[PDB]
Write a protein that binds this ligand. Structure first.
Ligand SMILES: [Br-]
Length: 559
C-alpha cells in the first residue's frame, strides 16, 4: 500500500523550506500576457522516502512548459548584523535556490516539504500552436501536474488555471546590466580564456542573460579592475591586443572586440558597456594590461602604474581615439557606455577628477556611467551619469536627475529591494513597480555569476559557497549556477524577471489609460506611499496588484 503524499499549488513568490511547516496559502490561478514567462510551483511532502518520482504535466501549453526541482543551497552568512524585521529567516542552513533539470532525479524526503517549479514561456499570439480565438479578450488553459512513484502508482496532482490575456507584453526599454564575469566561467569549467570552448560557454551564459531582460553587457577591453585586492589580480580577460613598438609606443588590434560585439548583436544585447579603465577605491591605478614585446607577453600596467602618471595617460591618448574609430566604423555611436571607477568618496575627488579628465579629452559625446550614492559629490559636477544605490536615491529623485539609474549590492541590506536568500520573493519582485513609479531608465547589478571569494582571493564552488566565503549575504554575488553545459537558474533570477515583466505591464497600462490612472491603481489601498524603502512585503498584495493591472489592460479601450 502506497505512502501518504500531499501537495499544495503555490505562486512563484513562495520559498518552500525543507525544515519547516508550510503556512503559505494555495494558489491555483493566475494571468499572463503573450510573450510573458509565467511561473508557479507545487510543494509536496511524504512521511516516507520515495526516490525518483515521475512528474509530468498535461496541458495544451505543454510545448511552452518546463518542470524543474527546487534544490537546496547552503548559506553560512545569510545576514549582516542586525537584519530588519522583513527577513524571512536569519540562521545559517539550507535555503531553496537552484533549479535542477527533472532528468537529474526528484525525491520525496521523509517529513520534508520540497517543491517543483513550473515555467511557461509564452510565445507571441501569431506563433501560438493551440487554436485560440483571435477575437477573445483572454482564454484560460488548465495545467495538470501529476506525481507518480517509480513504478507508475499515482501519488498526487494539482491543477492550475492560467488565463492568457490577448495582448503582448511590450519590449523592454529599461536598460539592464548584470555584470558578466568571463573569468569565472573559464575557471569553473577549466577552459582557457577565449578558447573556442570558452566562447561557446560565453554564448550560453549571454543567451540566459538576454532571456532574463539583460540588454547591456559588460565588455572587457582589459581585465575588469573589480573585486580585486590591491596588489592582486584576476585571470587575464582582455579583448584588446596590445603590441609595444617602443617606450610609451603601442599598436592595437580590435578583431576579438569585433567578435564580442557581433556575439552581442546576434544574441540580442543592445548596448555595450566598456569595462572600467581605472581601479576601485578612487581611480588611483590602472587595470592589469598585457602587451607583446617581440612575440612575448608582459604586464605593462596595473597596481604599480599610477592612473595620473604620464605613462598610462600616453597609453590612453593612443588607445582611446582608435577605440572611437572602431565604435564609429561599427555603427555603435549611440549604443556604448564607459566607466571610470565606482563610488569615489569625497577623499578621492582629486584622483577621480584626474582620471575622468583623461577620458573627457577623448570621449566627448559618449555616455559615462559611475556608481555614486552621494548627492554632495554629484553637485561637484565630476560624474556624468550617476548610478545611486536604491537606499540612497531620494535626493536624486527630489532634484530631477536625468537619466535616472539605480543599483543594489551587499550594502543595501535595510528595507529596500534585494535578492538575498534570506529575503522574501516579494521584496525582490517589487523592484519592477518602484522602477515604474520613479521613471528609472536603467538598473545595474555587479553579480550575474561572480564565483570567487571577496577580493577574488580564491575560486569557490557556488553549489557549496553562496556568500563569497562569509563576505556577502548569500544571493548577492550570483543569480546563476554552473550546470554541466551552461547556466542553471535560481528561483531569485526567475523572480527578478517577474519584476521586469511587471514594469513592462505597468508601461503598457500607461500607454492605454495614462500615468495618473496606472499609478493610482498601483497605490490603491496602501497605508504609506510606495517608495524604494516602503512597500507591502506580502505575497497576496503583489499577486493581487499584478492581477488588477492585467485586468485593467484586458478591459482597456484600444486603438
Ligand atoms: Br521596460
Amino acid at each position: 500500500e502506497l505512502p501518504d503524499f500531499e501537495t499544495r499549488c503555490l505562486s512563484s513568490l513562495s520559498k518552500v523550506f525543507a525544515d519547516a511547516e508550510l503556512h503559505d496559502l494555495p494558489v491555483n490561478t493566475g494571468s499572463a500576457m503573450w510573450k510573458e514567462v509565467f511561473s508557479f510551483q507545487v510543494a509536496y511532502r511524504s512521511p516516507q522516502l520515495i526516490k525518483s518520482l515521475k512528474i509530468s504535466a498535461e496541458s495544451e501549453l505543454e510545448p511552452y512548459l518546463a518542470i524543474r526541482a527546487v534544490g537546496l543551497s547552503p548559506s553560512e552568512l545569510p545576514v549582516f548584523p542586525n537584519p530588519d524585521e522583513g527577513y524571512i529567516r536569519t540562521a545559517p542552513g539550507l535555503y531553496p535556490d537552484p533549479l535542477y533539470p527533472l532528468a537529474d532525479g526528484v525525491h520525496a524526503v521523509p517529513n520534508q516539504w520540497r517543491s517543483v517549479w513550473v515555467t511557461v514561456s509564452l510565445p507571441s499570439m501569431s506563433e501560438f500552436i493551440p487554436a485560440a480565438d483571435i477575437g477573445a479578450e483572454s482564454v484560460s488553459f488548465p495545467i495538470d501536474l501529476c506525481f507518480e512513484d517509480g513504478k507508475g502508482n499515482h501519488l498526487g496532482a494539482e491543477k492550475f488555471a492560467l488565463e492568457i490575456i490577448f495582448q503582448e507584453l511590450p519590449e523592454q526599454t529599461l536598460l539592464h546590466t548584470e555584470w558578466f564575469h568571463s573569468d569565472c566561467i573559464a575557471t569553473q569549467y577549466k577552459v582557457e580564456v577565449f578558447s573556442e570552448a570558452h566562447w561557446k560557454l560565453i554564448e550560453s551564459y549571454v543567451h540566459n542573460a538576454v532571456n532574463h531582460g539583460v540588454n547591456m553587457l559588460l565588455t572587457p577591453l582589459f581585465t575588469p579592475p573589480l573585486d580585486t585586492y590591491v596588489g592582486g589580480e584576476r585571470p587575464t580577460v582582455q579583448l584588446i591586443d596590445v603590441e609595444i613598438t617602443g617606450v610609451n609606443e603601442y599598436r592595437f588590434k580590435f578583431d576579438r572586440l569585433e567578435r564580442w560585439v557581433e556575439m552581442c548583436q546576434r544574441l540580442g544585447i543592445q548596448f555595450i558597456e566598456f569595462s572600467h579603465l581605472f581601479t576601485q577605491w578612487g581611480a588611483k591605478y590602472a587595470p592589469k594590461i598585457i602587451a607583446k614585446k617581440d612575440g612575448e607577453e608582459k604586464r605593462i600596467f596595473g597596481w604599480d602604474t599610477e592612473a595620473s602618471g604620464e605613462s598610462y595617460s600616453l597609453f590612453l591618448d593612443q588607445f582611446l581615439p582608435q577605440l572611437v574609430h572602431f565604435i564609429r566604423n561599427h555603427h555603435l555611436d549611440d549604443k556604448v557606455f564607459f566607466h571610470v571607477s565606482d563610488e569615489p568618496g569625497m577623499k578621492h575627488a582629486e584622483s577621480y577628477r584626474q582620471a575622468s579628465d583623461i577620458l573627457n579629452k577623448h570621449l566627448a559625446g559618449f555616455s559615462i556611467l559611475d556608481a555614486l550614492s552621494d548627492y554632495d559629490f554629484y553637485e561637484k559636477g565630476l560624474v556624468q551619469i550617476p548610478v545611486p544605490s536604491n537606499d540612497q536615491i531620494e535626493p536624486f529623485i527630489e532634484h530631477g536627475v536625468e537619466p535616472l539609474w539605480t543599483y543594489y549590492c551587499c550594502g543595501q541590506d535595510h528595507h529596500v529591494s534585494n535578492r538575498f536568500f534570506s529575503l522574501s520573493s516579494p521584496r525582490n519582485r517589487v523592484l519592477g513597480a518602484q522602477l515604474y513609479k520613479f521613471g528609472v531608465q536603467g538598473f545595474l547589478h555587479w553579480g550575474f555569476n561572480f564565483w570567487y571569494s571577496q577580493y577574488s582571493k580564491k575560486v569557490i564552488d557556488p553549489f557549496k559557497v553562496t556568500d563569497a566565503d562569509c563576505a556577502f549575504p548569500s544571493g548577492d554575488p550570483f543569480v546563476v549556477y554552473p550546470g554541466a553545459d551552461g547556466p542553471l537558474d535560481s528561483i531569485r533570477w526567475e523572480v527578478f524577471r517577474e519584476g521586469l515583466q511587471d514594469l513592462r505591464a505597468l508601461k503598457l497600462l500607461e500607454a492605454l489609460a495614462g500615468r495618473e490612472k496606472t499609478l493610482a491603481l498601483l497605490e490603491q489601498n496602501l497605508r504609506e506611499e510606495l517608495t524604494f524603502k516602503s512597500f507591502p512585503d506580502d505575497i497576496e498584495w503583489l499577486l493581487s496588484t499584478r492581477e488588477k493591472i492585467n485586468r485593467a489592460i484586458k478591459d482597456a479601450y484600444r486603438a
